[PDB]
Design a protein around this ligand. Structure first.
Ligand SMILES: *[C@@H]1O[C@H](CO)[C@@H](O[C@@H]2O[C@H](CO)[C@@H](O)[C@H](O)[C@H]2NC(C)=O)[C@H](O)[C@H]1NC(C)=O
Ligand SMILES: *[C@@H]1O[C@H](CO)[C@@H](O)[C@H](O)[C@H]1NC(C)=O
Ligand SMILES: *[C@@H]1O[C@H](CO)[C@@H](O)[C@H](O)[C@H]1NC(C)=O
Lengths: 13, 179, 189
């Protein structure tokens, strides 16, 4: 199987 | 709980250092080599059973980099306080003369995740056969790290693990010699 | 190098109870050592942990698509990854090698310490007990505690303070998930 990446949320500029 | 899996990431300025790893119950499953853009399994067997698209780690680190800039600004440029490491040297098995063993240098409870580690044999730097882990996350959000030295035990050799960290006034040496 | 450092951390955590029957997902953001905002699957929205994280909580909570990604994580991320790694993590079992050797509490003195060295085991949960002639000895026992080797193995030393007498047989007993019955090692004076 393939490990999935949780993504990191983008902070507002 | 029975188990915890953590995807842990960091980015550090001004060093521009970034790490991405997976932890299972306190052990590293894998991390991503950012320069090579490759997945490094902690035990080689792991990679025979699973895969990971290293590129996804790169995308996250880029986000972490952008977020750090924002948060640095939000905090009015409040920097990290150095927390110096605790260092322990031990062997991986009971020691027997001229029976192959491994010295372990455990570097614990420190931040930022930047350290210089040197193995010394009789006061001299040694690099033959050494290995090390990436920075490993702690639940108090400090860090852990391991350095390893295969060696042949003898009455004639002493060893030291020398650790430099910005939280230390002078380098820390932890000694080992045959009991 | 005295230049100030600034550190960002993110920890995406999956917590498992009873296999995958109950799962909790935490999306955690840190500045230096301080957690400033988090998504808890128990809640289903981001919450500021400190004032510093409030803008992020509010911005992220306004993004419905982002929130639904996080809300599905227990399934699409946690349960998935558990399935991927289960055969070599959850099911990983390595028996310990057990060695008993005498030692000294203070130099020059005769042997007055028995070391039970327990090495190379996984997972970490272990029970080590000392016996003198078939009777458990609970006094004078000291240990290193559980030591991680960093390579998916553990070790621990369990020491018994004792003055060995001729004829006595000491036993170190080890219980561990990898074993189906206690592992015992004898030491004779
Ligand atoms: C790790 O090793 C280097 C060895 O010198 C340390 O020092 C350097 O410090 C100067 C200070 O002006 C700068 O050039 C850099 O910060 C370092 N690198 C080089 C190549 O000079 C470095 O600080 C050590 N790190 C720790 C945490 O002790
Ligand atoms: C940063 O400074 C601004 C004004 O200069 C102030 O309003 C704000 O509270 C400060 N933030 C922190 C985290 O100290
Ligand atoms: C754990 O899981 C099993 C089956 O999935 C279930 O029958 C049991 O009720 C659960 N609860 C426990 C072990 O407390």
């Amino acid at each position: 199987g393939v490990y999935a990446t949780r993504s990191s949320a983008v902070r507002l500029r | 709980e029975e188990h915890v899996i953590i995807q842990a990431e960091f980015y550090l300025n001004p060093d521009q250092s970034g790490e991405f790893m997976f932890d299972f119950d306190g052990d590293e499953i894998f991390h991503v080599d950012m320069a090579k853009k490759e997945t490094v399994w902690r035990l080689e067997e792991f990679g025979r059973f699973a895969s990971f698209e290293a590129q996804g780690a790169l995308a996250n680190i880029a986000v972490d980099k952008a977020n750090l800039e924002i948060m640095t600004k939000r905090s009015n440029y409040t920097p990290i306080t150095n927390v110096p490491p605790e260092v322990t040297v031990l062997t991986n098995s009971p020691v027997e003369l001229r029976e192959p063993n491994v010295l372990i240098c455990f570097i614990d409870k420190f931040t930022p995740p930047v350290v210089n580690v040197t193995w010394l044999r009789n006061g001299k730097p040694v690099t033959t056969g050494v290995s090390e882990t990436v920075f490993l996350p702690r639940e108090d959000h400090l860090f852990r790290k391991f350095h390893y030295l295969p060696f042949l035990p003898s009455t004639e050799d002493v060893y030291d693990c020398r650790v430099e960290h910005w939280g230390l006034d002078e380098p820390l040496l932890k000694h080992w010699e045959f009991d | 190098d005295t230049r100030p450092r600034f550190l960002e951390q993110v920890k995406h955590e999956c917590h498992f109870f009873n296999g995958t029957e109950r799962v909790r997902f935490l999306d955690r953001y840190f500045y230096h050592q301080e957690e400033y905002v988090r998504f808890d699957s128990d809640v289903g929205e981001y919450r500021a942990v400190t004032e510093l994280g409030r803008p992020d909580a509010e911005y992220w909570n306004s993004q419905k698509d982002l929130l639904e990604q996080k809300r599905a994580a227990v399934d699409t991320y946690c349960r998935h990854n558990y399935g991927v790694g289960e055969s070599f993590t959850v099911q990983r079992r390595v028996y310990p090698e057990v060695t008993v050797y005498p030692a000294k509490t203070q130099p020059l003195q005769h042997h007055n310490l028995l070391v039970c060295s327990v090495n190379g085991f996984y997972p970490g949960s272990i029970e080590v007990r000392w016996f003198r002639n078939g009777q458990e000895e609970k006094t004078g026992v000291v240990s290193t505690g559980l030591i991680q080797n960093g390579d998916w193995t553990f070790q621990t030393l369990v020491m018994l303070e004792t003055v060995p007498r001729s004829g006595e047989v000491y036993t170190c007993q080890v219980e561990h998930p990898s074993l189906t019955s206690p592992l015992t090692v004898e030491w004779r004076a």
